[PDB]
Amino acid sequence: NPIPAASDLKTRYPEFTGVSDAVVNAIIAEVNGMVDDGWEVSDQKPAVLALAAHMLSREGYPGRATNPNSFDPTNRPILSRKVGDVSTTFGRTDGGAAEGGANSYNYSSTVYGQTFLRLLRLNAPAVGLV
């Protein structure tokens, strides 16, 4: 990975246009380690570009929240609601919420992590000798 892909996901993923310093310097540097030169050329840029957005959207929005400050450090899903008389119901997320993981990192939460996972399986067979 000669070039850490920076400031380009805003073109690749148009929904992210709020902040750039928390993107390029604070997160991209955390993702460009997973990519290796043993991958193919068609994947190294898109894979890191997708995983960075997965990490961003795992939190509220690029930096920690959207314009309104309503962010939840525990991603609690919203099952239902009603606005004739305001009501909401959430899920339970303590270790694994529902068909989820509790000892690994769950890459299959948003679409972005799913893209990263489908690339990672293609390019990185896991087998060792030691």
């Binding site: 919203i78 609601r81 606005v83 305001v86």
Partner: protein, 110 residues
């Protein structure tokens, strides 16, 4: 992740919103109503006690009412043209936490 008004999109229809701005009075005391602005818009109309007949001595006429649940902002005295006839807004219940309102419509033509 919030989307409630996504329910109003299942059933909707093109009604012409007609926003109103008031006028003033002629020096002789009369009234001048003006300043309409029209815009095609989507609503979800339901017939809550519509088309009640009235056989008055003067003849026959109907009494039509409706409810709206529209996404745009509509005040209490505007017009909505639907199905070829105009309807005047009785009362709105705006919910600014979300984007939608709830409106009562009464047919204007006697």
């Amino acid at each position: 992740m919030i989307d409630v008004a996504i329910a109003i999109d299942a059933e909707s229809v093109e009604v012409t919103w007609r926003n109103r701005s008031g006028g003033s009075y002629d020096s002789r005391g009369n009234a001048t109503g003006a300043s309409w602005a029209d815009t095609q818009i989507r609503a979800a109309i339901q017939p809550v006690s519509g088309r009640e007949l009235q056989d008055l001595p003067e003849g026959v006429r109907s009494k039509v009412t409706l409810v709206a649940w529209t996404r745009s902002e509509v005040a209490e005295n505007d017009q909505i043209i639907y199905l070829g006839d105009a309807y005047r807004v009785y009362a709105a219940r705006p919910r600014p936490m979300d984007g939608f309102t709830r409106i009562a419509l009464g047919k204007v033509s006697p």
